[PDB]
Amino acid sequence: SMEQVAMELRLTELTRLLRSVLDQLQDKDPARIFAQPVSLKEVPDYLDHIKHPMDFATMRKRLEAQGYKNLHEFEEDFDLIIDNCMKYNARDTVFYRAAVRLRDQGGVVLRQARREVDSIG
Ligand SMILES: COc1ccc(CNC(C)=O)cc1
Helix, strand or coil, X not given: CHHHHHHHHHHHHHHHHHXXXXXXXXXXXXXXXXXXXXXXXXXXXXXXXXXXXXXXXXXXXXXXXXXXXXXXHHHHHHHHHHHHHHHHCCCCCHHHHHHHHHHHHHHXXXXXXXXXXXXXX
């Protein structure tokens, strides 16, 4: 139907917007600490600790399949990256601190993205 096409056009431009957002958020991780899933070969006990792993590569895969229906779904995944890290790693580690900095610096980006998604519809 025409309605379905219209819907798919909105999804496509949402995906376009979120691609930009994801790029800006990943720029705030210059150490690439969150770039790839935590290796279960190198960290064998990880899944005993973290029940829903997430990372930028995995988000990007979902993104390009147009798998984020709205900004909330995207933000959930971003928050998993940060929250998993702040639980698995202690406060005095480069990993925990990178998560804090990513959350802080990311807030600006996400604040504007929400306004753009709302405004553009
Ligand atoms: C192989 O060495 C490692 C692997 C993972 C981590 C923690 N990373 C995250 C995102 O939690 C630390 C050391």
